[PDB]
């Protein structure tokens, strides 16, 4: 058990510098992928063999295999650091919302649980004795009983929300309390294993955890004689903020173009059948001296032909077809050809291009609105900068001695380390008001001077 | 000054005198300064162009190697998908300047084997470089006048 302290202390080193460790993957991904650009396939072992050609230098030895595991190991420690630094809070976020729910809402008690994604799974923790294991409050079961236990079947409430024999043991823990010795590494299995399953379910639903884990599997899989190491570049190079906006643009309007591109597939279908019925004898790709390869023979073959050439032609279908100068139906094709030019290339492709480019027409604006609010509004009280520019630096000083939205966290922190006896005539005022979770104490429209306008500047 | 002195060599250096002074027009200065104004933006964007083609570069070099086949007379020693770097140079010398996708200087995909795979490769190329990425690059420069 002596190495346990060092093992925990060892993990402190890893969690000390996590982002720095993540950064090594970026630089290491370049070198492992940059040198991959010297491969040379050949039909001879050094079936075919994917021969690798090197340069005059002494590296790109089998040390690349050591470099391959080198890339995986630096990623492997990221798992522990993420598991030891980024997920004592993920539990807390879910812990707080449910506890705050139970204080005000009785959805699990009064009407019905919520069509319940990420909410149906939450029923497991109700019977777990170690629900408040992370949240600040460790007595939530007693508040909920006070408000809803009496109005309903008290035994039913005392049963659904846990309370193992606590109906008669509620008053039992009032005389005294002994202190049992710790039994670590001896009775560790005597824990809420059912709650452990609940914790894991939250982990596998985390957005961030999967992506980093999804990065691991290719690194392990990359050790096969393949080029899988290139995929490491894409999913991390997106970490740049300005690059994220570009890639997220297609995601933002995904619900719009999906119904629009479908209309493209049906319009060509109309033009597909009309030619297959009448204009069959003109396609004629005309391989040497024989014509067994007519695109307008099978119902599906003609369809595949148009969207492999026509929409990628850039100039209409009349660029890979035969000459319409024949006497028969001379004026019909130009009706078919020109109408094709307007109704797919000129219009439909422009629309598809329009929506994607218009995505920046909104994403860029959102990056500017987050700056105008700072110049005008203080986000604390419903006042702009117009009144604060009457005096020089008036909006500037408003961020230092007035509400700076930073001292408030300090102000709350001072409350914990202060006993209930020592609270002033107003410090205790907010503390009680804070507990019932109203938020009328914030200024919201006046900061020390509007009420003190006519009295004294 | 230095080009004017250097222009006395039997060369055409005197043409460079035109460019750096003809910019003195005010309305012309706005045009040339437009690319400078948003220089910090496209530099990170054009980089994404160089990596997307790289993904399409390796996938064809691994699977679609036997289709490029520029086919000089009676022999084929010039296969763009032979060296790791040669194939990369080929795509951004032709593909992005093709105007119509990579399926304009490649051989016929009408073969029975892998017939439906190329059209997946070809069409996805058409959307994800020519239709979108070039339009974005054009968009920022024109928006500079905006």
């Amino acid at each position: 058990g002596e190495l346990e302290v060092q093992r925990v202390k060892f993990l402190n080193y890893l969690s000390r510098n996590f982002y720095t460790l993540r950064f090594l993957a970026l630089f290491l991904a370049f070198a492992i992928n940059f040198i991959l650009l010297f491969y040379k396939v050949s039909d001879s072992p050094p079936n075919m063999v994917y021969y690798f050609l090197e340069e005059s230098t002494g590296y790109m030895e089998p040390a690349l295999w050591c470099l391959s595991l080198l890339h995986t190991l630096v990623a492997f420690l990221c798992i522990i650091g993420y598991n030891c630094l980024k997920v004592p809070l993920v539990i807390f976020k879910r812990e707080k919302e449910l506890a705050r729910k139970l204080e005000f809402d009785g959805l699990y008690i009064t009407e019905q649980p919520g069509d319940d994604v990420k909410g149906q799974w939450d029923r497991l923790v109700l019977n777990t004795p170690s629900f408040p294991s992370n949240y600040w409050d460790k007595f939530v079961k007693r508040k909920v009983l006070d408000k809803h236990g009496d109005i309903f079947g008290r035994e039913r409430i005392a049963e659904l929300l846990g309370m193992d024999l606590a109906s008669l043991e509620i008053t039992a823990h009032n005389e005294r309390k002994p202190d049992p010795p710790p039994g670590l590494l001896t009775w560790l299995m005597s824990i809420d294993v059912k709650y452990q399953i609940w914790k894991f379910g939250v982990i596998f639903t985390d957005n961030s955890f999967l992506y980093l884990g999804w990065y691991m599997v290719m690194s392990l899989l990359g050790h096969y004689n393949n080029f899988f190491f290139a995929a490491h570049l894409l999913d991390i190079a997106m970490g740049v903020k300005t690059l994220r906006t570009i890639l997220s643009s297609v995601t933002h309007n995904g619900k719009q173009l999906v119904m629009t591109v479908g209309l493209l597939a049906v319009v060509v279908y109309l033009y597909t059948v009309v030619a297959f019925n009448f204009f069959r004898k003109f396609y004629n790709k005309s391989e040497d001296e024989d014509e067994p390869d007519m695109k307008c023979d099978d119902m599906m073959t003609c369809y595949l032909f148009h969207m492999y050439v026509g929409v990628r032609a850039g100039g209409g279908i009349g660029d890979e077809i035969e000459d319409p100068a024949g006497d028969e139906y001379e004026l019909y094709r130009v009706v078919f050809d020109i109408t094709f030019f307007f109704f797919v290339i000129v219009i439909l492709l422009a629309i598809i291009q329009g929506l994607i480019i218009d995505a920046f027409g909104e994403l860029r604006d959102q990056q500017e609105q987050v700056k105008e609010d700072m110049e005008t509004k203080c986000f604390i009280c419903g006042i702009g900068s117009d009144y604060f520019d009457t005096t020089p630096h008036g909006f500037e000083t408003h961020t230092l001695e007035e509400h700076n939205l930073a001292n408030y966290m300090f102000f709350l922190m001072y409350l914990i380390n202060k006993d209930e006896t020592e609270h002033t005539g107003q410090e205790s005022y907010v503390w009680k008001m804070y507990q019932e979770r109203c938020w009328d104490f914030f200024p919201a429209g006046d900061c020390f001077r509007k009420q003190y306008e006519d009295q004294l500047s | 000054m230095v080009m004017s002195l250097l222009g006395h060599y039997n060369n055409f250096f005197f043409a460079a005198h035109l460019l750096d002074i003809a910019m003195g027009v005010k309305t012309l200065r706005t045009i040339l300064s437009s690319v400078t104004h948003n220089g910090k933006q496209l530099v990170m964007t054009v980089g994404l162009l160089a990596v997307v083609v790289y993904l399409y570069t390796v996938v064809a070099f691994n699977f679609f190697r036997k289709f490029y086949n520029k086919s000089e007379d009676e022999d084929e020693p010039d296969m763009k998908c032979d060296d790791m770097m040669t194939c990369y140079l080929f795509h951004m010398y032709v593909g992005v300047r093709a105007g119509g996708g990579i399926g304009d200087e490649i051989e016929d995909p009408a073969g029975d084997e892998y017939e439906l795979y190329r059209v997946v490769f070809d069409i996805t190329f058409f959307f994800f470089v020519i239709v979108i990425l070039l339009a974005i690059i054009q968009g920022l420069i024109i928006d500079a006048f905006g």
Partner: peptide, 26 residues
């Protein structure tokens, strides 16, 4: 190498995709 996709299989898959897209807002 990979599986060889015939016309009917791809047609059925893509048509199921299209019908699912329509029926999710139909």
């Amino acid at each position: 190498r990979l599986r060889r996709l015939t016309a009917r299989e791809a047609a059925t898959a893509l048509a199921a995709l299209l019908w699912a897209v329509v029926a999710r807002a139909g």
